[PDB]
Amino acid sequence: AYTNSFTRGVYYPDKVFRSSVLHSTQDLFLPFFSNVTWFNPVLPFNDGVYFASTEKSNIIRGWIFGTTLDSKTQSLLIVNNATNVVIKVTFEYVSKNLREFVFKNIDGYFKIYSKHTPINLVRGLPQGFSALEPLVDLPIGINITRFQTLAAYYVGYLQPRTFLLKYNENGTITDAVDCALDPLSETKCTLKSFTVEKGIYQTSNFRVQPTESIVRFPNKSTNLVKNKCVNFNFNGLTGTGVLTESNKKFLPFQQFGRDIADTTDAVRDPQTLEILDITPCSFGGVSVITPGTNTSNQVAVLYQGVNCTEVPVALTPTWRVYSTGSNVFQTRAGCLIGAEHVNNSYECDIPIGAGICASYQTSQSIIAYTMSLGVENSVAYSNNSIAIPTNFTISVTTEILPVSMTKTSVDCTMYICGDSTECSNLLLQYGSFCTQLNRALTGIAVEQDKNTQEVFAQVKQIYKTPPIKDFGGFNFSQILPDPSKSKRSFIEDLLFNKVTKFNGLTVLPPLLTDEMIAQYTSALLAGTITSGWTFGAGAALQIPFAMQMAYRFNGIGVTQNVLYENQKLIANQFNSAIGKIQDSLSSTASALGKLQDVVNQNAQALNTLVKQLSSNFGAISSVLNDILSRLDPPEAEVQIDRLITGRLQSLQTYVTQQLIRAAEIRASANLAATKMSECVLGQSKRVDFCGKGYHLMSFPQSAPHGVVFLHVTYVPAQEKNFTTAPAICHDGKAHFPREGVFVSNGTHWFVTQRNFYEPQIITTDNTFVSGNCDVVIGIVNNTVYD
Amino acid sequence: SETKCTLKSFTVEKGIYQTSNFRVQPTESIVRFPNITNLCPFGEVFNATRFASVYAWNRKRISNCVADYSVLYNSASFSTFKCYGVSPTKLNDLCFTNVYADSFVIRGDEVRQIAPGQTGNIADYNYKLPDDFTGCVIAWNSNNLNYNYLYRLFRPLQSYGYRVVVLSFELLHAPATVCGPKKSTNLVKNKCVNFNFNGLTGTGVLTESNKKFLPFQQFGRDIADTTDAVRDPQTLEILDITPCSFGGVSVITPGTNTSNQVAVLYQGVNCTEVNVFQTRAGCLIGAEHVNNSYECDIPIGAGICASYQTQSIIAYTMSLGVENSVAYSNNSIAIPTNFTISVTTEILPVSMTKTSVDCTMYI
Amino acid sequence: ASALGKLQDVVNQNAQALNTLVKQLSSNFGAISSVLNDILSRLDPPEAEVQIDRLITGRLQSLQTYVTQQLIRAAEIRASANLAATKMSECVLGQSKRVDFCGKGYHLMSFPQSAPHGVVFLHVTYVPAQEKNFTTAPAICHDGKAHFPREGVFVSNGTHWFVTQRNFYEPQIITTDNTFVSGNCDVVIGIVNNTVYD
Amino acid sequence: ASALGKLQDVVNQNAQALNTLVKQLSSNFGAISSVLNDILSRLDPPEAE
Ligand SMILES: *[C@@H]1O[C@H](CO)[C@@H](O[C@@H]2O[C@H](CO)[C@@H](O)[C@H](O)[C@H]2NC(C)=O)[C@H](O)[C@H]1NC(C)=O
Ligand SMILES: *[C@@H]1O[C@H](CO)[C@@H](O)[C@H](O)[C@H]1NC(C)=O
Ligand SMILES: *[C@@H]1O[C@H](CO)[C@@H](O)[C@H](O)[C@H]1NC(C)=O
Ligand SMILES: *[C@@H]1O[C@H](CO)[C@@H](O)[C@H](O)[C@H]1NC(C)=O
Ligand SMILES: *[C@@H]1O[C@H](CO)[C@@H](O)[C@H](O)[C@H]1NC(C)=O
Ligand SMILES: *[C@@H]1O[C@H](CO)[C@@H](O)[C@H](O)[C@H]1NC(C)=O
Ligand SMILES: *[C@@H]1O[C@H](CO)[C@@H](O)[C@H](O)[C@H]1NC(C)=O
Ligand SMILES: *[C@@H]1O[C@H](CO)[C@@H](O)[C@H](O)[C@H]1NC(C)=O
Ligand SMILES: *[C@@H]1O[C@H](CO)[C@@H](O)[C@H](O)[C@H]1NC(C)=O
Ligand SMILES: *[C@@H]1O[C@H](CO)[C@@H](O)[C@H](O)[C@H]1NC(C)=O
Ligand SMILES: *[C@@H]1O[C@H](CO)[C@@H](O)[C@H](O)[C@H]1NC(C)=O
Ligand SMILES: *[C@@H]1O[C@H](CO)[C@@H](O)[C@H](O)[C@H]1NC(C)=O
Ligand SMILES: *[C@@H]1O[C@H](CO)[C@@H](O)[C@H](O)[C@H]1NC(C)=O
Ligand SMILES: *[C@@H]1O[C@H](CO)[C@@H](O)[C@H](O)[C@H]1NC(C)=O
Ligand SMILES: *[C@@H]1O[C@H](CO)[C@@H](O)[C@H](O)[C@H]1NC(C)=O
Ligand SMILES: *[C@@H]1O[C@H](CO)[C@@H](O)[C@H](O)[C@H]1NC(C)=O
Ligand SMILES: *[C@@H]1O[C@H](CO)[C@@H](O)[C@H](O)[C@H]1NC(C)=O
């Protein structure tokens, strides 16, 4: 009776050869997963017919097409047999397995496509994909409405559909996507890819269509319909909207009502004293929320800014799943279909709006929730209790900053006209727009090199680390260059591996090559390791790395003996943090998304500029050669003028957006240069500038069009509670700590530094006397030993 | 002097200036047409014994023949000959897909009604032309050669008491079948030439290709919708299409104050198509390569700099700095015993010139 | 005169933009003539509007291009002015510890001067000049006690040990007023025997 | 009522931009009318294009 068509009924839309390209084509195709009748009887033709036959003995012989099939009409008749393919109409032409055919009538011509493939022993249509290659074409121009076949054969009907075909390495289509099958397929068609990464993509526009037409004239009349999206005509007022009764008080001479933006929002009925409130019909965006196609094919649909009652009204059965289902949720962003509401607050996975986030979680499905800002905490605050850390962790943080773009120069004249004297002469009448665009692009290109030079070329000499790596136990082998293998470090190789000329388009090479950038980075690293911050102020002054770390603890507020007593532990923590950085870089590739974003943006803009050359712009054709060879010069100056206008507008848009992006990249490069000067060439006291924690030091690494900063910081780990006092009274005189806080466990009072519990006996050396004991609030009684 | 013209100055400061573009010109013209000689049956359409009425216009399909529109447009007997979207002069050069021939008889007042976008009873009830009509209409006096020429007035034939021929084409993508009297030309390869293939012209390099064209395929296309390959009309061979070399031209100058020698860089152009140095930025002509490394004077690209030095223009790989090895050890420290006071000047823009433009008065 | 290029560059860009905008007026933009007076004199009012519209479109496009370029340039100049004001607040009105924010070396002061459409900062900084080699230790081991320097580092002129500040060689006798005790000599790596004067 | 000026300036600028964009729909741009329906049902299909 009926069976599933799976992914059958696809052919080559034209004779143009394509390879390794995903092509989107709108043509009469057989919709995926449609119902194809399984069977002599006469059948309708409609706009097209798909045919199939698993005839083991080739019982099926031929076909008949026509309108009445007997007299008074012309009928096509094929008696394709094992000897000679015979076709008759006026026109005569002579020329287990699964045979497929496609018949269509696009005005003229009668196209036939065919395919012959082996199959296993199955009853229904097999799975997999296949391509139908045209065999013959009949320029008959005959009207056909019914047809017949002259023993199990399937019949399908073609429909006008948009498909995305994936051409393989050599001209053959390997896969196809039916755009209207379901929201995931529409997302694939919109992104022009067969894989979709996790996110939310605004794929379509939803609009409520009018239900009928209303004509109103004073005493062609029609009844007045309210409370629904209806097309109306009020004495020449052509518009579409929802009509509701108004509480407005129109003056008797007034016939229309307009808002601030001069849009008619109220109307008066010509035949009655009724004032109707014109409200625009519902519209908005349609976004598809998906996890990665690697994880699941489930999607949710968000209709933006509409109630959950209008989404049924104004498709394939696969899409109808995403219109009802009781999962229907209403949020201030719009209507969600396909996602569960759990009212459990989690971290945001995919934003929706108004504090709503969606995630793919466990049977796994899509859940919508209110995003959690963080884990609750109440600090045990009291006027005599202090928390002091007794340990620490050395943390290494990675910061990534873009520094430059790709230097692209667009040949203005060759892009607009291109090897065309007539078009160039016509373009000469537009002035200096072309020179302006060239100058702007050249300025951007020079600015990119300036950005790179100002970020990296900051060291005056090329420092070399000594061959003996006696850096107090710290291990820099993963960030120092390896001569035995570019000469890039391990992390730099990881970064470069991870991150990855016609029509008047040229790409200029950068002035500094990656080897030179790596040499700058190596010089900075060697200078920092062997001298500290002295090389950024004057000549590089050598100092042992342990003493430099003692300097940096003194800078963050921790005494030197802490380092000199935990030197092995700190070195091990730093080495483990570096190893963790290496492991994370090897595993995940989402950290380098800041440079990849710039690369993708530039590539997409350039691709749009290239594709704009195929636009007609209201001319005869988009090809100047075709226009010139088809039309005479006096009448070919209009189509060429339209092409000039369109291409000039496109180029101006590209140049403007390039200038804005160049400004953004220049800001990023200025920030990167500031971070190199302050984080790498010194120790910064600005909070959260060189990473989270107390900044100890930093290391630069080069990445494609960017720099990566490894921020070594200090993080206190294990706090403990103590009793504290602002001052202590010994001999009627208040004593204050010279540097630190007063603490007490439960019996005795000591003085300790703030960031590391190290209690010393209170002494006149540790404290200073100031004032009397009758003024300080919270003073406690104790003794000070001299 | 080209740099001087570009900069609108008689003196140029040292640096590199882009002046113009270099493009390889085509060598010869190639016309490759199928070896088909049978003439199209225009006589059977323009010399028929009679024509049908306006409501029963007959169509004749013209294909697989060589058409000669010169005989058509060189005849003064045709009273009206106006063509839309195509030129009668270029009709012979153009090669079409499927030529149609519609014949009917109308009176003089309805001749102008046979035109795209024209309204009226004749156009709206008998024969309407598309808004994107390609082809044209031919009419001539026929009062010499009688009530068999009817006219439909309602949509109802109200017969009363000029022979018209209409041609239609579609030059968009389909393989061409009706060519003109153009002659074929031998095929050359590996040289930038001007080529014509069944109607679409171009300029580029034709080479042997390994593309696996299917038997029904006529030409190839790239990602950016550019004709990358083609099939020879006379031979089953497949020819690639590569654009002729092009690029920008930059002039490295030490300054007209210092000297008058210049260097020329062809950006992205291999030295073959152009004291010749090949760099990753292009072909450098006029500068001598030096193995020594100096500080960058005039940038070129990919770590290459140019400088006026012993006196000639030299091109080198820039030196990133002076090498230094810090005498690092675990028990040695370097401490300064003196100092210098340094005063450094920093310049920062703060504002521009405030300008106001009256849009109405300017325009 | 190339030291003041930035202000000269800004002046040159503004003048070039204005000059190009003025020169754009003498362009046909597809019309038969580039002057409305001659267009109106030659053609009748019904058909002069055809050319007037082309001139209007071209001049509007040129004006919009000029205004957009000016907006981008003004955003850049605003960023530069914000940087200049920050330098004014942090380097003339105070002494900044940020590295290379105001000159190379340890910032001592800065002086402002006015330049056409700009400001000039004279950054006075301190730069160490003549370094010398010394033998150093992280700490010195007295009779069972490990002594660390309060402010500076230990140095040795071959035979004897002193304590000196970091940025200037000013050796001083090691005393209990110069060093502080923390722990014993076993834990510290690189400790050196010496004596501390009390 | 003047301390919170920057936020008010941003809001006013955005609202003015949106209002101007909407108001431009009533502009004529050299056509016979700014109403697309009037343009359609006032001329023949080819001259209305
Ligand atoms: C420290 O540096 C200063 C300045 O470089 C030296 O002062 C110079 O000394 C030489 C030799 O005595 C004189 O000829 C110069 O005239 C001095 N210049 C100035 C500005 O006074 C000084 O000698 C160096 N050494 C010490 C120990 O101060
Ligand atoms: C052509 O494409 C097929 C994939 O369908 C591939 O297996 C084959 O290696 C390619 N090349 C040739 C010469 O067949
Ligand atoms: C849904 O409808 C209610 C009233 O029925 C309305 O208050 C609410 O704003 C609507 N939702 C949205 C997103 O507009
Ligand atoms: C969350 O939803 C569940 C439904 O199973 C319900 O039982 C629970 O009360 C809800 N929580 C809140 C806070 O409303
Ligand atoms: C501090 O933490 C380290 C490991 O992070 C370990 O030595 C121990 O847990 C702590 N050390 C002391 C002395 O408490
Ligand atoms: C430093 O780490 C690398 C890899 O983590 C290791 O191969 C090397 O042995 C380490 N250095 C030392 C001195 O152990
Ligand atoms: C300090 O006391 C508070 C409240 O008594 C407690 O919540 C906190 O855990 C204590 N801190 C430590 C380190 O035990
Ligand atoms: C507090 O610390 C001192 C340190 O000398 C110790 O003697 C005393 O027993 C401690 N008391 C408590 C309650 O921990
Ligand atoms: C802390 O606050 C409590 C609450 O009144 C008070 O009794 C106590 O004296 C205060 N202690 C100090 C040291 O201020
Ligand atoms: C501290 O000691 C003095 C003298 O013994 C006494 O007057 C004062 O009240 C004491 N303070 C407290 C808080 O007990
Ligand atoms: C046209 O040329 C091809 C190749 O030389 C040849 O095979 C073919 O027979 C020719 N056509 C005719 C009609 O001879
Ligand atoms: C340039 O042409 C030569 C000779 O054909 C060739 O060897 C070389 O690979 C080409 N490219 C470059 C960058 O030299
Ligand atoms: C420069 O180096 C290349 C490569 O080793 C060599 O062939 C050439 O002779 C050298 N020229 C000079 C002048 O040193
Ligand atoms: C210090 O010692 C190193 C190595 O012995 C030597 O190169 C250097 O000249 C000496 N003096 C200074 C001021 O660095
Ligand atoms: C080191 O300095 C001390 C004190 O200035 C001096 O007595 C001694 O002779 C010096 N030794 C050398 C080798 O310079
Ligand atoms: C410094 O390193 C060397 C190894 O070259 C070692 O012999 C020496 O003992 C180290 N210094 C100290 C103070 O341990
Ligand atoms: C330092 O002195 C102690 C005690 O006098 C002694 O045990 C130790 O061996 C000495 N170390 C050196 C390196 O002289």
Author numbering:
A (entry chain A): 27 to 65, 81 to 130, 167 to 172, 187 to 241, 263 to 331, 529 to 623, 629 to 676, 689 to 811, ...
B (entry chain C): 297 to 441, 448 to 457, 491 to 496, 508 to 620, 641 to 676, 690 to 742
C (entry chain C): 942 to 1139
D (entry chain B): 942 to 990
Publication excerpt:
Severe acute respiratory syndrome coronavirus 2 (SARS-CoV-2), responsible for the COVID-19 pandemic, uses a surface expressed trimeric spike glycoprotein for cell entry. This trimer is the primary target for neutralizing antibodies making it a key candidate for vaccine development. To stabilize both proteins in the prefusion conformation two proline substitutions of residues 986 and 987 were performed. The region encoding for the transmembrane helix and cytosolic tail were replaced by a 27 amino acid C-terminal T4 bacteriophage fibritin foldon domain to ensure protein trimerization.
The cryo-EM structures were determined for both ancestral and Beta spike trimers after incubation at 37 °C. Single particle ab-initio 3D-classification identified one main canonical 3D-class or map for the trimeric protein that corresponds to a single canonical conformation. As opposed to the ancestral trimer, most Beta trimeric particles are classified into a single model with two RBDs in the up conformation (here referred as two_RBD up conformation). This map was refined to 2.75 Å. Density for the Beta trimer up-oriented RBD is only visible when reducing the electron threshold. The 2xPro mutation was clearly visible in both the ancestral and Beta trimer models, while the other modifications fall within regions that are not resolved. For the Beta trimers, particles can be classified into a unique 3D model where most of the population exhibited two RBDs facing up (two_RBD up conformation). Moreover, this fusion prone tendency observed for Beta is more pronounced in our structure, where only the two_RBD up conformation is present. The two_RBD up conformation of the Beta trimer stochastically presents the three RBD amino acid substitutions, K417N, E484A, and N501Y present in most of the VOC including Omicron, resulting in the potential for higher elicited cross-neutralizing antibody titers. Here we demonstrate the Beta spike trimer in the Sanofi COVID booster vaccine has a preferential two RBD up conformation, providing twice the surface area of exposed RBD amino acids compared to the ancestral spike trimer booster vaccine. Beta spike trimers transitioned from 100% open trimer to ~ 80% canonical trimer in one day after incubation at 37 °C and by day 5 were all in the canonical state.
